């Protein structure tokens, strides 16, 4: 009763606690070993930064039971506005002691006012300064401290390991993890503190700096004592948003902390942090759903972007089944980047808006439910730092503003991103409500959230551990596992970092957690470490535990290599995931830790693995894994040699292939995979299997695991995209097996015969095997082939249907809703002149059909599986979607047929048959099935910008062209600095963002989308908005786009008010006519706008809506008029054969021969004669414009100045190119024509026009000697550092030829004096080799200025 201490007891220990404060005196374990707590009278409580010392009258004590005691603390300071009652609970269980603040009463406050209003006198922070919950002393045997801080740098360890001596002097030294050891015992301190502090290396905030342990020294008699305390906790924190508005937000959780007292837990004869770390796992926080991390063998990204629907949800399900077959059903983790709105970096932050063009919530749920049966987990990429006007969440309160009241702008790509006010988004309840929108759609089907960019200070200048803890909680609360971008981010709750798992990003300073303490504790719970990437060195030179190496094949960054993806899983990820099924128990001889980098007391042993690195791991069933390094010397070949043993038996040996792709290795393995792909439980003894991989290929012998020792044979299968193949029966002798393996080819070994994994291709897709993933077999089992020709499944990467000759491939459609409208589109690449068709039939009769001739438009969709960098045939891909529209019949009998009509040897490629509900009905036909009219308001587009297809103005790219969406007033002209409307009519339009001065086609129609019949006339009209005069133009062409062979009509400015465009088109003789939008060489008028206003303004954009194409009546002609028009055309051009190209003459002869076929056919009608006449009239207007083009190149070479001005007014192209790609400006600079050049530049000449050799007019002006031209060109916008085909800049050419006045003008205008050509020479070196010492000294003084 009068004793000032009490005793709490477990079967493992007894603890003495003080009655006057929640303090521990000492811990005595059953074996009599003692660990101190706080031996001194320290009674400090910190509230809001103020230390208050408690007296006897301020604390009441109550012993609840032998395992619990409650304290009531009166914490008061009148001057500092503090009057609180803190209730503290101390509990014990086994070797653990917990200290929890169970109640905080504020006498100076009524609470947080509604809507997170400011709470006056709020208790914001709380801590117990120098509480010393556990402590060690310099007088104890082997007294030491081990701490961990965050390091994303592969060369800089995050740990510290040192002896606790009399000289040890620390005060609130903060660590993420801290362990003390001494006198046979070890202990770590766990706290849920959101404090941010000291770190070794991290490129971002976002919870990277969470340090929860405070170490402090004090004198305890003759010895120095190092004690561990929790870092401060946040309770009711007051925060400010970007508008200066203040809020008080409640605690993420009440304050909690604990210790777990360990002895020699790993039984190695030493007591250090590793023993304390094993015990620490019993009290530490565990990220939500981290128990599934070892199962996630196949990580990857499935991408969608810019309305294209490159990867609809039911195609992602098929790719899951493809990877399930190739890995024998190992678990997967698919990150849906672009799951929402129009795709990746569209619709942020509308989390609940699942992409309608991908199949919406219904298809996403089917994909997730069915995918889970194959062990596949799904998660979505979200953004809580940047938003777009189109997002319904976009509001003025959501907008982040700067100290001046302006928008805090983000990235402009498809649309202009605007930063989100992170503090408003949290304190208002907005973010949590958008996550709830998503929760309603996905239910409990979705596994994880991938939070992009969090920590890069885009949402606020803070994004601390308190904000990240609250962010992870609202995510975890919906049943979602937390994953994020940056390698160092979110130490507390993230189970994956993209910049840790994808080792190619960021470089050696910006990777995953480089800590032995952190990886020892949590390797099995996260893919947030450093894997093999030797060029980074240090932690990245063959880590013994491996580390996730992530690749992709579904469009992310153009990644499409399926074979490289599978090869990579087996090279690094199968062994990394195997190692994660065990927990580290011992880790000695770490070469990265030395006395120089603060780790003098790091855990060593010369009796283990020759004093070289070794790690021991164990599971809860006592299975032991030992991973050993061949040598600790990085100059030895054995540094990268690793052996893995499972229960004393070698299961892996050798050097892995460098994770950076730089060197193949020699590693082989025979890994026992004992777990299912769901919760990771042990599969039944007979279902147990081994994975075999041999890097170089060859024959290796292995000892099978114990439970296989009595088998007399095993079954070995080669794994392919079709599953288990080439079954071999291999004999077992003395429990050993010999395996012959091809290089980098996976095999799976079973005890007996194994069945194939059951795969029903394309579930929910209305057709079986829509993506041609079923091998050659699919053309017998699923699709029916008929005809004299040939049908085959071709392509080693993304398999396709390839047709040759006359053949039909058909399949019955299932699960259609009778009477509903459907669109059916299929990707087609036709290399034959004969038609390739898609047809839907019902009971023998055709409901819908469409055809394409030879494909004329290459595919430039980076995230798409068949873009022109993927080699469909001949190093190119012309894949474009071909549509048919039909109403599902009441009979329920519908069949799709893909066919090649012609009997020639050329190929037709088809892939991805997609049947989707669609309400589009804008196409009207004539009786002959030809086009009567096509209208499109873009309100019912199944995907992409149909009837247009994206062109090559940016190469294979995540094209800055997409379907723009309405969200007034934010998307309309007038909001902020925005001058253009995103949408013209309805909710959707086609938008081009900032593609000015490309001098090429932006997008175009193609014959399979809209077919223009030879000779027929069409009226084309549309509504548009264009940011400047003449930046974009209407282009009309025939066949594959070629510069010079298209008709251009510049479009006038329509900025904020919708313009109307209309023109006529006569179809070319080959049925391949098209129209589109072209980016000219004309500079936009930015109207004095600066910075982000240049992009957000709309000055460089182009919006198109309400497209209307209609066949019009042309004036009727007789056969006589048609024939007379032939004589008239032949009279104008037959003589000009010499004046024409050998291909221009063939195009003229082609048209003429074809028009004569119309006139002279037996039974020709007035329609044929009118078509023949209209074709010749179009041929006339073409040959006439081509003549004015070569007459302009003739008048710019010889310098007839007045001919040049009249020719451009008559129609001649200012950018006419000769056979060497030379424009009239290239001829007016090489010949010196000042007046010609200026008028040309005003007209719209490309100042940076490159010829066949990349030579610009500025290159020619500098290489000849015209200073008048140089000043004009530089004023117009000539690129002073433009490089030709040999890397030569104009400065290189001026110095090489001998032009002193030129080198000075170029240098003044910004010429890079240290620019290297292809032979490494700079402009200075070119002067020395030619005898221009006077030029050389001018460039030498410029280089060192």
């Amino acid at each position: 009763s009068m004793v000032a201490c009490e005793t709490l007891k477990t079967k493992k220990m007894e603890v003495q606690i003080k009655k006057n404060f929640p303090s521990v005196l000492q811990y005595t374990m059953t074996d009599g070993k003692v660990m101190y707590g706080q031996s001194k009278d320290v009674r400090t409580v910190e509230i809001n930064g103020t230390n208050i010392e408690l007296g006897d009258d301020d604390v009441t004590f109550k012993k609840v039971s032998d395992t619990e005691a409650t304290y009531t603390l009166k914490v008061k300071d009148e001057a500092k506005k503090i009057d609180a009652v803190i209730t503290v609970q101390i509990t014990v269980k086994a070797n653990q002691l917990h200290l929890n603040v169970t109640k905080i009463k504020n006498n100076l406050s009524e609470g947080i006012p509604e809507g997170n209003g400011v709470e006056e006198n709020a208790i914001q922070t709380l801590s117990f300064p120098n509480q010393s919950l556990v402590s060690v002393r310099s007088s104890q045997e082997n007294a030491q401290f081990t701490g961990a801080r965050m390091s994303s740098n592969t060369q800089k360890p995050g740990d510290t390991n040192f002896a606790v001596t009399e000289d040890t002097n620390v005060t609130d030294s903060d660590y993420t993890y801290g362990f003390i050891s001494g006198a046979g015992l070890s202990a770590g301190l766990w706290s849920n503190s959101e404090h941010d502090g000291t770190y070794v290396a991290a490129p971002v905030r976002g919870g990277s700096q969470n340090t929860r342990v405070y170490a402090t020294t004090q004198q305890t008699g003759d010895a120095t004592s190092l004690g561990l305390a929790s870092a401060p906790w946040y309770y009711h924190r007051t925060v400010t948003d970007s508008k200066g508005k203040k809020y008080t937000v409640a605690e993420t959780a009440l304050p909690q902390m604990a210790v777990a007292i360990a002895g020699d837990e790993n039984e190695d004869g030493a007591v250090n942090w590793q023993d304390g770390a094993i015990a620490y796992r019993d009290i530490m926080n565990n990220p939500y759903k981290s128990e599934e991390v070892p199962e996630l063998v196949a990580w990857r990204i499935a991408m969608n972007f810019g309305s294209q629907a490159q990867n609809p949800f039911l195609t992602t399900l098929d790719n899951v089944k493809k990877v399930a077959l190739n890995t024998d059903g190992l678990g997967q983790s698919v990150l849906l980047k672009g799951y929402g709105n129009e795709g990746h970096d569209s619709g942020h932050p509308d989390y609940g808006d699942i992409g309608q063009r991908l199949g919406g919530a219904d298809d996403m749920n089917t994909m997730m439910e069915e995918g889970s049966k194959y062990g596949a987990r799904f998660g979505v990429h979200v953004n809580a730092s940047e938003m777009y006007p189109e997002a319904k969440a976009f509001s003025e309160d959501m907008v982040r503003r700067n100290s001046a009241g302006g928008l805090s702008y983000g990235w402009n790509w498809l649309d202009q991103g605007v930063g989100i006010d992170g503090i408003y988004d949290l304190a208002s309840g907005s973010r949590v409500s958008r996550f709830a929108d998503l929760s309603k759609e996905v239910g409990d089907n979705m596994d994880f959230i991938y939070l992009d960019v969090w920590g890069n200070l885009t949402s606020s200048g803070s994004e601390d551990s308190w904000e990240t803890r609250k962010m992870s909680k609202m995510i975890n609360d919906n049943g979602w596992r937390m994953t994020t971008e940056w390698g160092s981010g979110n130490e507390y709750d993230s189970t994956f970092q993209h910049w840790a798992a994808d080792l190619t990003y960021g470089g050696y300073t910006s990777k995953g957690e480089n800590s032995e303490v952190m990886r020892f504790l949590r390797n099995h719970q996260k893919d947030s470490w450093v894997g093999d990437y030797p060029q980074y060195g240090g932690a990245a030179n063959a880590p013994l535990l491996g580390g996730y190496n992530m690749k992709d094949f579904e469009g992310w960054q153009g990644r499409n290599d399926y074979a490289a993806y599978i090869k990579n899983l087996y090279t690094h990820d199968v062994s990394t995931k195997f190692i994660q099924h065990f927990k580290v128990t011992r880790w000695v001889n770490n070469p990265l830790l030395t006395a120089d980098n603060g780790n003098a007391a790091a855990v060593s042993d010369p009796n283990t693995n020759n004093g070289n690195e070794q790690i021991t791991l164990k599971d809860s069933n006592g299975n032991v894994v030992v991973v050993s390094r061949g040598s600790n010397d990085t100059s030895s070949a054995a540094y990268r040699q690793r052996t893995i043993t499972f229960n004393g038996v070698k299961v892996a040996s050798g050097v892995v292939s460098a994770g950076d792709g730089s060197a193949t290795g020699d590693e082989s393995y025979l890994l026992p995979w004992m777990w299912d792909s769901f919760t990771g439980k042990l599969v039944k003894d007979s279902e147990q299997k081994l994975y075999h991989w041999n890097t170089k290929g060859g024959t290796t012998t292995w000892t099978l695991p114990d439970s296989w020792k009595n088998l007399s044979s095993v079954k070995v299968y080669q794994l392919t995209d079709q599953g288990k193949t080439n079954e071999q029966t291999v004999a077992v002798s003395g429990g050993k097996v010999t395996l012959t393996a091809d290089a980098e080819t996976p095999y799976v070994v079973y005890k007996g015969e194994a069945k194939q994994i059951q795969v029903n291709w394309s579930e929910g897709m209305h057709v079986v095997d829509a993506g041609f993933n079923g091998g050659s077999n699919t053309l017998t089992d699923n699709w029916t082939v008929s005809g004299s020709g040939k049908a085959e499944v071709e392509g080693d990467n993304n398999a396709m249907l390839r047709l040759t000759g006359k053949v039909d491939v058909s399949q019955r459609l299932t699960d259609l809703k009778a009477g509903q409208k459907y669109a059916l589109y299929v990707g087609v690449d036709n290399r034959s002149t004969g038609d390739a068709s898609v047809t839907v039939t019902s009971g023998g009769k055709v409901l819908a059909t469409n055809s394409t001739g030879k494909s004329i438009a290459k595919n430039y969709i980076k995230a798409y599986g068949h873009n022109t960098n993927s080699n469909t045939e001949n190093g190119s891909s012309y894949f474009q979607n071909m549509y048919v529209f039909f109403t599902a019949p009441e009979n329920g009998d519908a069949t799709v047929t893909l066919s090649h009509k012609s009997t020639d040897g050329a190929h037709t490629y088809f892939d991805d048959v997609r049947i989707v509900e669609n309400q589009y009905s804008g196409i009207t036909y004539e009786k002959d099935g030809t086009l009567k009219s096509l209208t499109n308001g873009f309100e019912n587009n199944a995907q992409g910008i149909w009837p247009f297809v994206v062109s090559g103005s940016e190469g294979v790219e995540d094209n800055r062209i997409h379907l723009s969406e309405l969200h007034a007033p934010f998307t309309r002209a007038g909001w902020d600095v925005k001058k253009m409307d995103d949408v013209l009519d309805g909710t959707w339009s086609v938008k081009v963002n900032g593609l000015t001065q490309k001098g090429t086609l932006v997008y175009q129609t193609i014959p399979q989308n809209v077919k223009f019949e030879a000779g027929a006339k069409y009226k084309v009209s549309f509504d548009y908005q264009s940011g400047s005069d003449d930046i974009y133009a209407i282009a009309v062409g025939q066949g594959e786009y070629s510069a010079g062979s298209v008709k251009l009509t510049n479009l006038k400015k329509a900025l904020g008010e919708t313009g109307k465009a209309e023109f006529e088109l006569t179809g070319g003789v080959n049925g391949d006519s098209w129209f589109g939008i072209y980016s000219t060489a004309t500079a936009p008028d930015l109207q004095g706008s600066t910075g982000n206003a240049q992009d957000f303004g709309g000055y460089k954009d182009f919006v198109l809506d309400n497209l209307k194409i209609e066949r019009i009546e042309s004036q009727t002609r007789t056969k006589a008029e048609a024939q007379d028009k032939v004589k008239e055309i032949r009279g104008k051009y037959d003589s000009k054969r010499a004046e024409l190209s050998d291909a221009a003459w063939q195009q003229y002869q082609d048209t003429l021969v074809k028009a004569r076929v119309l006139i002279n056919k037996n039974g020709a009608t007035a329609e044929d004669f009118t078509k023949a006449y209209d074709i010749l009239v179009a041929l006339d207007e073409y040959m006439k414009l081509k003549d004015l083009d070569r007459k302009l190149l003739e008048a710019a070479w010889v310098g007839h100045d007045d001919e040049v001005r009249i020719l451009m007014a008559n129609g001649a192209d200012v950018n006419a190119r000769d056979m060497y790609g030379q424009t009239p400006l290239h001829l007016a600079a090489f010949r010196g024509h000042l007046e010609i050049v200026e008028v040309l530049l005003k007209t719209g000449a490309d100042v940076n026009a490159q010829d066949v050799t990349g030579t610009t007019p500025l290159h020619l002006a500098a290489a000849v000697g015209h200073l008048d031209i140089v000043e004009v060109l530089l004023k117009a916008g000539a690129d002073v550092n433009a490089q030709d085909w040999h890397g030569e800049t104009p400065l290189h050419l001026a110095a090489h030829r001998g032009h002193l006045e030129f080198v000075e003008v170029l240098l003044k205008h910004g010429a890079d004096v240290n620019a290297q050509d292809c032979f490494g020479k700079t402009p200075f070196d070119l002067a020395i080799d030619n005898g221009n010492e006077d030029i050389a000294e001018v460039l030498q003084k410029a280089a060192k200025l």
Partner: peptide, 9 residues
């Protein structure tokens, strides 16, 4: 003519 190599001596 092709001006690329004319420019170069």
């Amino acid at each position: 003519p092709f001006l690329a190599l004319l420019a170069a001596x």
